[PDB]
A paper describes a structure:
The structures reveal a head-and-tail domain arrangement, with the head-domain adopting an overall fold similar to papain-like cysteine proteases. The structure of the tail-domain of CifPl and CifBp presents an extensive surface area adjacent to the active site suggestive of a binding surface for interaction with a specific substrate.
MALDI-TOF analysis of purified CifPl is consistent with cleavage after residue Lys48 of the full-length sequence (assuming no cleavage at the C-terminus; Proteomics Facility, JIC, Norwich). This removes the unstructured region from the N-terminus that was identified bioinformatically, without the addition of exogenous protease. For CifPl, the N-terminal ∼48 residues are cleaved prior to crystallisation, therefore ∼2 residues expected to be in the crystallised protein but are not observed in the electron density. In CifPl the equivalent residues are Cys123, His181 and Gln200; in CifBp they are Cys90, His145 and Gln165. The thiol group of the putative catalytic cysteine is positioned 3.9 Å from the Nδ1 atom of His181 (CifPl numbering). The side chain of Asp202 (CifPl numbering) projects into a solvated pocket in Cifs and could be involved in either modulating the electrostatic properties of the active site or substrate binding.
Numbering used by the authors: 50 to 297
Amino acid sequence: SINTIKLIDDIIALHNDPKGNKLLWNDNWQDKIINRDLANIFEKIDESVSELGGLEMYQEMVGVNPYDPTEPVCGLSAQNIFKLMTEGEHAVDPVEMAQTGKIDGNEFAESVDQLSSAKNYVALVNDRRLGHMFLIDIPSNDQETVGYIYQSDLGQGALPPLKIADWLNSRGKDAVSLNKLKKLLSREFNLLSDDEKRALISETLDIHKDVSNVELDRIKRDRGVDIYLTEYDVNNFYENIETLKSKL
């Protein structure tokens, strides 16, 4: 019924549009993403630029052209795609929910094993070992229940720089077994050999599944993983995307 591969390609399209980009990657976490107003977002940019004496002067003082598209860092992309998936009539504030609805990587592993295949779920993952935030989409399925990872990465941790559209264009469409994700996010991850750690991380999170792209010395060994796992309605995910496209 809903074409889910097209959902992702439509996120990519929205990101590629000069005005769609500003709708999608805005940082208003408290209000519904579909409550975002292009005129209002651009007026705020225009006023900030006029206040500093125009674009040339703004760029001199700030070092960025605020009309350029945003290449979102990991938390900016993950939290925005999460709102796209989870909001219906009511807003979802992912900053707030990550703190109040948090479960740990081992609680996640117990949860995922009893999710209804008749329902869709999404996990907002703050991996404090990696310093990296990403999403695991676990959509309803009449076959094997699997996850799909949506992420971007500034590249300052254990992984290389990764642009949201490059990831989504293909790897974001790759199913990951629930067992691999449980293994990745469990405390027992630490007990793995360096080789196995690089294999698991690269397989799930690296654009080319390349072990030589994983720098283990950038990982904070002791830390755990904070997860907010919630049900979502794919009809909301679809319509929220439609809504943004319409705004254009």
